[model samples]
Every structure is written in structure tokens, then in C-alpha cells.
Target: TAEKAQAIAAARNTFARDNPVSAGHHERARRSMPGGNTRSILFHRPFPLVIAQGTGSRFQDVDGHAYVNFLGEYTAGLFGHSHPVIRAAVERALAVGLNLSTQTENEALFAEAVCDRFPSIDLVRFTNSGTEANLMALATATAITGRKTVLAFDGGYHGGLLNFASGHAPTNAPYHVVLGVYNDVEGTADLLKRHGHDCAAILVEPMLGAGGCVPAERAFLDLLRAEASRCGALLIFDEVMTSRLSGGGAQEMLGISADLTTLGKYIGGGMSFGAFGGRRDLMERFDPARDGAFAHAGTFNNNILTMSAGHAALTQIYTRQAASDLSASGDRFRANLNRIAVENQAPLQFTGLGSLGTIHFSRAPIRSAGDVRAADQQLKELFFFHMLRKGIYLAPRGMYALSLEIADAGRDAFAEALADFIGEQRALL
Candidate 1:
């Protein structure tokens, strides 16, 4: 054991010595790019790993260290990296031609397949990114309802659009959108009564994705449905992050349906793509058939390669049983973590649904962003850095999206890592 620990120490020492090279490169990059990173999620202490390549569930860093990738490119790689089915389809489509302005049969088939899986999606349309999909979904809702205000949760993240951003009040800028307390029935009902007339849509993540992974209780979701219906506003479920959990995603699993839906990430298989679909009557408003009431156009909309790969990847999701297995594994891991916290007297709590979870350093049950925001920052930092030294990878922001490829082995490793963490912190824990 000493030898193994010594080896790990040596590897860390060597890594520290070589880190300057990467840090210097990032520093130079900072001159051109703000904060030395393209995305805020990629920023981490001691610098982040620059990935070199990926195969299956594993990725090698620029430093050549390999780890089981739970991040999976921000929860995009549902079938893991370069899956053969997706790869073959992409190559075939590329060989034929990447894209043409004209529509393709593959695009139609892909949309149909996705709609079939999620019954609420009566018609589908492609977009360039999740941001774009959210934008389009909101725009479509506005066109259909002839209202400007949108309702969103306090900590909900809906792209960078002006309308949705305004919905997250006190934190968001002033606009037609109004903010509501997540999972708060009485507060939402009051807000709906006050501003229901101008509210075009109520956008929500059935499971909160940003700030921390928190699932909306069924009671809360039911309340939302009733409130939205009473206000004559459409409910839009954003499934961009949770689509990997099951064949029909969180909406179907929860037995709830949104008037409009936005999807991205895993749906593209391994490519850059996004989509928004909804009930037939609402989506038909965008129909190029009736002189299209809503304006929608993109240069890369339904690009051939993305459609081909997406079709192939989505087919796997429908045919395979990985979703159920992955969900069960996540449940097991969450239970194990909770057990460790209790046994070790650690003031920790875990929250999430399906394969996505988060660790809270506080003893209190997390119900909203305020709970996480009010936690002891020093304690969280100490715990996260300790886990990092133990070679357990986690989001710097404290979220985890377990991949379908993460099975028993990864769960056991995580459980062991939790034990090690608690033992190391025994004095404070």
C-alpha cells in the first residue's frame, strides 16, 4: 500500500512539475481568450486537462493521463465517444455529401423517430445548438400565444436569450419574463394570478441542470401543469441534459408532457446538433406549408452528417437497455454516498434524479439554489480538493452526469473514493 501511495505521489509530483508548461500555454491563450478558457464549465483549479482523444468511455489528456470520463463532453456522448454505429453513419453521410440547402429524407426519418419515442413531440425541427433550440422554442411559443412574458424558476438556466434570461428575476435583467420559486406551488399560483395574462410560456427543467442537480418533485410538476393551464401558457420542458437517462427522457418517465420540448447534447450521437419539437398544432405554425407564420432558418439546419449520426445514435437509444441499467447504477451510487456520509458523520447530502447527481457539503436537504448558495464554501472547497487528490474526477461546479458506460466498476470506485475522502477528513467530519 505504501508503494502504491508512493507511486501516486510521484506521479502527482511529476504532474506538478510539468503543469507549468500547460499553464503557460493557457496563460498565452488568455491573452486572446478571456479567462484562458472557451467555456466557464472547463475552468478548474491547477488548470484543466486538455483532452487529446477519446474512445468509448475513456479519454486521454494532453498529459497522457487516462481516466473514466464521467463528464462526457458536458453530457453529450450518450453512446460514448466514436461509437461504431454513429461513426459508420457519419462516414457514409460524409461520403455522400455533408450538407446541401435542399431537404433530405434522413432528416425526416430522424425527426419522425424522435417524435415516435416522445409522443408529445408531434412535429420536430432542427437547430444548431441547445441555445438555439431554446430560443426557437420560446419564439414559437410567443408566436402561438401572442404573449411576451415567460415564466421560469429562480435558478433555472434557459440559454442566454433575453426573454428567458429575464424570467430568472432578481438575478436576471428586467424584461417581460417573470421568475417563480422552484417547486413552490403557492408562490407560483400567486405569480400566475398576477401576471398570467401576458405570460407566453412556462419553461422549466423537470430536473434542474445548472447550479446543482435537483429533481422537481412530482407534486411540484403537477402544480406547474395546473398553474400553466389556468394561465393559458404553454409548458416547455428542457431535456437537453437529461435525455440520456432513458429512451423517452425525463418527461415520459415522469408521466408528464410539455407543450413544447427542447433537446440537444446526446441526441447528436457525437456531433454538434440540437432540436426543438412540440405538439402538432403549435409546431405547425412554423410550417413552410402555410406561408410559415414563424420565421425559422439556419445555414446548418439538418446538415446531412448530423442527421445521419443522430438517426443512428437515437436508434441505439430506443433499441438498447442501457438507460435502465444506468439509472439503477446512479441510484446505487447515490445511496452509497448517503450511507458513507451518515456512517462517517459527515455533513453531506446528495441530490439528483436518474444518472445526474450533486454533492452538498451541508447537512440540510437541498430544495433550491439558495440552499447550495448558502453552504459553507470553505468546507466544500476542502472536500472537493481532497477528492481531487484521490484521483476522483468531478465537475468543479460539483455536478456529476454519469454516463451509460459507467457501470458497477465505476460505482465501486466512486464508493471507495468516498470512503477514502471521509477517512481523510475524519477529524472535521
Candidate 2:
């Protein structure tokens, strides 16, 4: 273990020494960006690489170092970078002029593709991002039921939207919403009992995204479905991140359906796009013809380029079985990591569904954010920094989202990285 840590440190130092220009750029970015980077996911231990471009599963850094990217632009590059199919689709859409204020045939085509996969959606709408999709879903729910309050999960991260972020409490505000516990049906049911009458919708991620990648159990999800139905509250699956869990989404994988569904990332084929859909009757409330009662409008909604990109992305996922293969790869990766941890006598934990894998640097399973708060931050930080130095890029938060490009070689990289990590933390553990 001591030797391994030393090797990792050595490798990291060598890489840092070789990339002076990247370091300088990072230092400069810190002048304006809070932490030398704009997005939290982009931040690394020593610093992050400024990439020049990407091709297939491999991306090259400005410093000339190349690696197979498991991070995949935070799970957006499921088809890899500069994928011929996706690039061509984007080119064609751009040539045709993507946004046309009115309507486009691609809108109906994209909607049909999404609805065909999940049982929860009979009708659908387009949005530029997951945040807007949830906003629109909540707005339509409130308008249809004449209720403003919403129920969400504690560890669940819907988006950067304002309404979804508000804690789980009743309010007369237009987009009032509340939070519950992740995978805690009893607690969620109790909260529903108290405020279900005023709640227009109950939003849940079958698996928490950035909140430690915890998965909602079947029993808990089933209970949520029954309770929401009984309470006359709409059920929303914020599958924006988890949509890649299966060809449809986590709801289909879990055998639980939602009243409305939101999708992003992988479905966009590395472009900026999101979508929302549900039963035709409920979705009809958002129809522009229905007066100004339910206000939902976005200029970029269903822009031709985004739709074409999405069409290309979804077609790849649906036809090639990459989504399923990636999910399986994640399972295998977790099993291998756990085996290695046990062999090394290191206390590590893993939790997630589909392609997502969260490694908790603790002996016990992580149940919530509070558990994460109690963890050894210093040790984990050291480990993260060490890994970065080794030329392997991760989510920075200690979670990994597998891409379709992660085949035998990718799995080997993860195993090698874990072995190197164990070596570095031998004494610390």
C-alpha cells in the first residue's frame, strides 16, 4: 500500500510538471470563476485538464495527455465525443436552421420516440433543460388540480430550478413545493398525509443524482406510487439523470411509472436539450390554445438542432443496446471495486443504479447526505487528488457515471485505478 500511494503521488507530480500551460490557465480562471472552474463537476484535486477536443471515447488534454473518458461530460457524452452519427445529425439540423418560432416535424418525431419507451407518457413537451421540464410539469400539475404544493425527496436533486429547490413545506406561492426522505416511504407517506391535499405533484428521482447516488428501493417506490394515486397528486419521475438507466428510464427498470417524466443528458447526444411528458389528458392543460391559464413557453423549445441531436442520441441508445450494456458494466465495475476493497481490507462503500456508481470512503453504507457529512473529508480529498494525478478523471464528488464507450479496456482502467488508489491509502486506512 505504501509503495502504491508513492507511485500514485509520483505519477501525479510528473503529470502536473508536464502540464504547466494547463496549470497557468486554471490559475487564471480562478480570477473570475469561484474555484478555477465554472461547474462543480469540472473541478479536480490538483486542478482539471483543459481539453482541446475529443474523438470516440478518448479525449486529449491541452498538455497532450489522453485518457478514456468515463466522466463523459457528466454523463452527456454517452455516444462518445464527435460521434459520426451525432455530428452529422447536428450538421444537418444547423444547415436547415434549428429554431423556427413555429413548429417542426422533428418535435413530433422526438416526442413519439420518448413516449414509445415509457408507459407513463402518452403525451409530451420539449424544453431546453431539465430545470424547465420540471417547472413546466409542476405548473401543469398545479393548473390541472388547482393545487400549488409539491412533494420531493430530501437527497433528490431535480435541477437548478427555484420551485423544486424550495423545502417541502406548504405555501400559497405559485410553485410551492416540499422535500421528503430518499427511499423512506414511511416518512414520505406521513408527509403526504399531512399535505397531500394541497400537493399538486410528488417529484422523485428513482435514484438520487448528485446526492451520493443512493437508489430508491422497490418497496419504497411502490409505496410512493400508491400514496400519490390515493392522494390525487401527480407523480413525476425526474429521470433527467437516471433516464439512461434503461432504454426508457428508472421507472421502467423499477416497474414503477410516473405521471410525468423528465429527460436530459444522454438523450441529447452531447447537445443541450431536455423533455417532459405524461398522460394526454393531463398534458392537454399545457396546450397554448387553452388561454393563458397554464403559462409554458420557451423560445428554444424543440429547436431543430437540439431535436436532431436528441433524435440521433435516442436512436443510438434504443437500437444498439448501449444503455443496457452500460448499466451492466456499472454493476460489474461495482462488484470488482468491492472485491478489490475487501482484498485490501479497506473500508469502502458503493451504491447506485444503472450506470452510476458512488464510492463512499466509509465502511458502512451511506443512507443520506448527513451520513456523507460525517465522513472523513480529508482522506477522501487526498484519494481524489491522487486519482486525478494518475490521469483518470472522475466526477470529483466520488461518483462515476459509465458511458457506452466503457468496454473491456475502460473496465480495466477502473480496476487499475482502484488498485493504485488502494496502494496510496494503505497506511491511511
Candidate 3:
């Protein structure tokens, strides 16, 4: 234990010494913002790097250190920094005006694109973030079903406020949440059978994104579908992070359709955006023309900036073919990383699908968040600092999402850095 503590301290010290400028910025930032940052996840021990600027697939920190943008803004930076198409769209919107505060043709065009691309969405509504999307989807289900309970999976993160990683987050929506073990078909099925009748919807991520990128088993997903139908409850898929996995998101890839789907991330084309949609019949509940329709409101739900940029991204940038190619590349990258881990006899493995993944400090097969919880956190922290030193900017939690700008060379360099870390840490590992 003492040796491990010494190792972690040494890594922290080295990181502190290497980024004096960032250290100074953090101290200055704390005087203005609590804990020197606003976002909780971005705050890491010692201090977090203050990025100054980014271009293509690389970003330079305030300390003048450069890093490959593997973090991908937690899967929201699909177009990378200053993408020409996205930039052009933003500039075009600015020429028109910032907030028209009224309906725009761009909003209609964006909605059409989203409805056409997502298999489950026949109609949709926009939101400011993924958290609002999930909240609205759940509310719609409850309104239609007249139920107050929802069936959720462990480790599934729909948004900032809809987290169920360890259990319920302190600020989670105040609904009767029925937590079930992810990937456990029989156990989850039993839980559903016992409580499904009272559930407004069964919400799940086709693959656990924030929960270590663990993909769900086909059988488990199919079971939820059957059980939800049997209990007359709606099935909702939170594809916020997994939408980039395929042209139509994970639901299409899995050959399953949800009654409602929540999406965000790159769909906004690097702008702040989110949306929820599904079957025409279900979404009609929000139709203003219909009597007793659910009321929905947002100030910037149809902002011309988000609408134009998202439309440009979907049509000109991450098209169907692009999504497929990126998915294929991600598969190859993870396979190579897995092979390297085995060859080096490292006590770690990669788990994920498509362009999103996470590094877990365990060789065990990860089925649920429980497996992720069992990982060696100290080793994970060490790996984060090690990768940072090697010029890779990964999530502090060991998550990685590939952007369209990351080329073969970037993947190769990441693998090489990983190999070096494994080899050098063989003694501790």
C-alpha cells in the first residue's frame, strides 16, 4: 500500500512540475469559480489543465503543452475544433442574427434530418442538453401511461441528472426509479416482471456509455423489450453517447426500436443541443394542435445556430458512410489495444463499441457497472497521468472517444504510448 501511494504521489508530483502554468491558472480560477472549475467531471486531483485553443485534432493547454484530442469533449466534439463546415454554418447563422425568437426554416430542416436519420424517431423536439431530453422523454412516457415509476439500469448515464452509475445520483429526477442490473437478463427480467406494471417506461442505454462503454447483450435488450411490452410500458433508449456508433444509432444496429429515443452529443455539430423523439403516435402527445397535449417549452430549442450547424454536420460532415467508416476504425483500434495489453501482460483491458471506449484496470469480463467498480482506481489514475505525459488527452476517468479528425497516425501513436506505459510499469502492474 505504501509503495502504491508513493507511486501515485510521484506521478502527481511529476504532473504538477510539468504544468506550472496550468497550476497557476487553477489557483487564479479558484478565486473566481468554486474548486477552480465549473464542471465536476473536468476537475481532477492536483489540478486540471486549462486549454487555450484547439485546431483539427490537437489542443494546446495554457501551459503550452499540446495533446491529441482523444477526449472528444466527452463524445460531443465529433467535428473536432473549428471544423470548416461547422464554422461556415455558424458564420451563416450570425449573418442572419443570433436569436430570432421565432420559428425558422432551418429548424424544420434540422428536425426532418433527425427524424429521417434515427429509426425510432418519427417526430422530435429539441432541448438545451441531453439531460433535458431524457427528462422530457420520461415525462412523456409517464403522461401517456399515467404511471409514476421508471425502470432504469445500473451504470447507465442518460445525462448529467439522470445518472445511475453506483445508484441514484443525489440530484437525480425525483421519480420512483426501479434500478436493475445491466446485462443480467434473468435478474432484470424478474425485476421488470415484478414492477413493470407500474412503470411508465423502461429506460436503458443499448450500451453503457459513462458506465465504462460496456455494450449490452442482445438477449438482455430483447428481454427488456418483451417484458416492457408485456407490462404495457413504453421502452425508451438513451442513445445520447451511442448515436455516433451507427447511421441510425444503436437501436438500428441492434435491430430493435424504442418507443422513444433521446439523443445529443455530436448531433449538435459542436453546439449545445439535444432532442427526444420516437413513434408518431407517442410523440403526438406533445402536439399543440391536439387537446390535452403535453406542454413543452425552451428558449433556444430552435435557435438558428444549432439548427444550421446540426444540419450541416449531419448532411455534409458525419454522413451515413462516414459513421460506418469511423465505427470500423474504432473496432480496429480497440482490437489493437487489446492485443497490446495481452502481450504486455498488463492488468487492464478495453471495453467499448464503435468510436467510444474506456480503459479498465482489470482483465475480467465486464458485464455491468459492478465490474467497473472493482477496477484498480489507483492504477487508472496512474495511466491517466502517464498518457498525459505522452501527449494524449484522455478523460480523467480513462474514457476515450475518437473524433473524425483523428487519423491512423493518431491511433498508432496512442497504442505505442499505451505499450510504453505497460512496459515501464511492469513492476507495479
Candidate 4:
């Protein structure tokens, strides 16, 4: 890491020189917003583009450059920039009203739609974002079990305050969090053996999303399921991002079910949305009609726009067949990217499940974040810059999330971009 500092710096120099217009805008925007950004993931070296406009899978930056969007709004913009079905639904919702200040029929209808998609969820309560849903899930667990200890995994990212990207972020909500080694069935089992009795919930992502798109081994998840049931701790699967991988999310695809499942990211048709739900007996604790019911409050829990848009997107646009096909397509595309890398003898590889992927700088087995941390990270940075030059937009950290809007032609263009990069820098690779 220390040795490649100069190489990383040189690549960023070219990036800064290439985007004068964006640099100017970021500087001006900084006067109003700190660091010219609100979200941390959107920030990168030099500066990020002030995106001007978007249509489907394509977007233009402030610098008058066009690019095929591969970030997919970090897995939230699955409907793309302007999906007609979603747009029409939002339009119809606006005609009805904005804030009715009371529960609408659409809310219950959308809840039923969501329940139909995920069999594990018996009843669900909505939130404004995944972050809030995660918090509420934790609160529910602690309250039910009367235990403060929570089991979480290293490299797992639940949301803004529940993040474990850097091993319990400073801003993380305070809990008796016991960290487990991800994908290490034996190591995590050891941690659970010691803390399982005191735990209220065992929170995990079926696949590591922000830390790197490494999928959890089946046996690892199996061990968690067994332990959670053994100790009476609810197995909380944070499928906020992975839910997009299938109609029933990763848990359903893998034949595992969570006691409480949290969802967001494209579920509400790209609007701000989230939901947490599970067994009826447990979720019924929130029913106001019940005595000693848990109090959960949010003004926009069932906002009219999200209710209508999510209902339309789930029922009409992203049917079960569409979900299955998209995941299959993404699996094939990611495999092809790895094949090209290996054929060219580049120290590159991609790890993910379905439409989610992250480019690793090393070909070593990536079972966990430790494997990703040991790779030649500078190479990954170089790849991001080269892809940018070729008009392919992805996360600076090398995340690739394909949108429903990107057709075969767009994928072909992305494949060509990677092959050229490998050929151009063959010696370095």
C-alpha cells in the first residue's frame, strides 16, 4: 500500500486535468455544501461530476461528456433515471395528493404486494430509508429478548448508522455489538458460542455489499441460522441491497429465511423507502390495537408517492420472471468479465451475486473483506480512471450494479472497455 502511493497520485492528476468544468462546479457547490458533497460514497479524488441530466441508463455530466451508468445509484436506481412506468405511477399519485395526513388505501395495498413477494415477511412496517428500518429492527430485537447484546459481522454495512465498513463506525448507534468474522464459518461459530446466549439479534448481510461484493458461503449462513434458533436470537438479514437480486431476495434464493428482513433500494421504485417485517406473532407487537404495543413513529412511513410507485413497479414492471431473468443476466455478465481478465493474465477478478459486483485487484480467493484488503488496491483505482476515460461510469471503489434499463448493447460496450484497458496496460497488469 505504501509503495503504490505515487502511482495512485499520478492517475488522479490526469482525472483532475480531464474535467475542468466539473472541477469548477464542485468548487462553487462547496460554498453551500461541505466538501461539495453530502454522501461520503459519492466523493472521490479530484472531484465528482455535477451530473446534468439522465435518461434511462445514460447520463451527461457537467463537462458535456456522455457515459453509460453502471453504478445504478449504488443499487437503488434500478428503475433507471426516468422509467416510464414509474414516472406514470408518480404522476398518478400526484394527481391524488401529496400529504393526506392519514393512512391511504395504497399503503395497505403496497404492504400486501411486498408480503406477496417475500414469503418470510408476514407483516411489515415502512420507514423513510433503510437506515431507519435497521435501527427499528435492532430496537425490536432488544425489546423482545430483553438483551442488549447484538451480533454483527465485520465488513457488513447495514446503513448510515449501522455501518461496520471500518469496524464499527464512530457514528454507529450504540449497542453491545459483538463482531464476527464474515464467511469464516468456524471463526464466526466460535464468536456465537460465547455471545449467542446474550444476543437479541444476529444481524448480517446475505452478501457483503459496501465492504466488497463477496458472497457468503452457504455453510456460513447455515451455521448462523442454526445458532440463532438455538439461542432464541432472531436472525436478522439485512437484505436492503440484496433484495434486488431476486423477487424474494437472497434469503429466498438461498433457501434461508430471516426472522426479520429489512428492504430498500429500488423496492419503492427508486423513491426513499424501507420496510422491516417477519413472523406475525413478533410483528404484531407493533399493532396499536394490542396492549403494550411497541411505539414506532414516522410521518412519511407510507408516503403516497412511494406507495403508488412501489405498487406499480412490483406488480406491473418488475414481475417475478423479470427479477429472475435480470439476476441470470447479471451472473453471466460478471462471469464474462472475470474470464476476460484471466485470459489476459491481469491480476483482476470480480466477486458478487447476480447484478451486484465489485472489481478486485487480485485474483486471490475473496471469501471476506480481509482478502479484498490484501489486494493491490492501486490497480483497482487505475481501472476506475481508465473506465471513466472510456465513458463508463462506475463507483470509484470499483462497484458495478447493472440497471434494468441497460440493454445488451450497453453491456457489450462495458466489456470492450475492460478488454481495452487490460490490453493497453498489459505489462503493468
Q: Which predicted model would earn the best TM-score?
A: 3
**Model 4, stretches more than 4 Å misplaced?**
1-4
Instruction: Please provide, for model 2 over 1-429, each residue's C-alpha lDDT reduced to its tens digit, 9 standing for 90 to 100.
Output: 465456457656765797888898899999998988666557664677798877777788888777777777676767877678888988988787845677878878877777886668888888888778877877777878888888876666666653322243343234666777676767877998899889889888777777778777888788878988998889988888888877777876777778888877777677777788887888877787876546667888878887888887776544437677777878888888889888888777767876788777888667655566556655565666555566666766677777666778777877788888788667776
Show the colliding residue pairs in model 2.
Answer: 5-423, 5-424, 168-178, 168-179
Candidate 1 lDDT:
0.75
* Candidate 1 C-alpha error for residue 94, in Å: 1.2
Instruction: Evaluate residue 166 in candidate 4 and report its C-alpha lDDT on the 0 to 100 scale.
Output: 70
In candidate 2, which residue ranges exceed 4 Å CA deviation? Answer: 1-19, 30-37, 44-47, 162-175, 291-293, 317-320
**Candidate 4 on 221-309: residue-level lDDT in tens?**
99999999999999999998898788899877899988999988788988889899988888999999899999999998989999999
**lDDT tens readout by residue for model 1, 345-408:** 8878788877788878788867776776766554555555554555555676666677666667
TM agreement with the true structure for every prediction? 0.90, 0.89, 0.98, 0.98
What lDDT does model 3 reach?
0.91
CA error at residue 227 for candidate 3, angstroms = 0.9
Q: Model 3, range 153-181, lDDT digits (tens) per residue?
A: 88988877888987887898788898999
TM-score-better candidate, 2 vs 3: 3
**Candidate 1: pairs in clash:** none
Ranking by TM-score: 3, 4, 1, 2
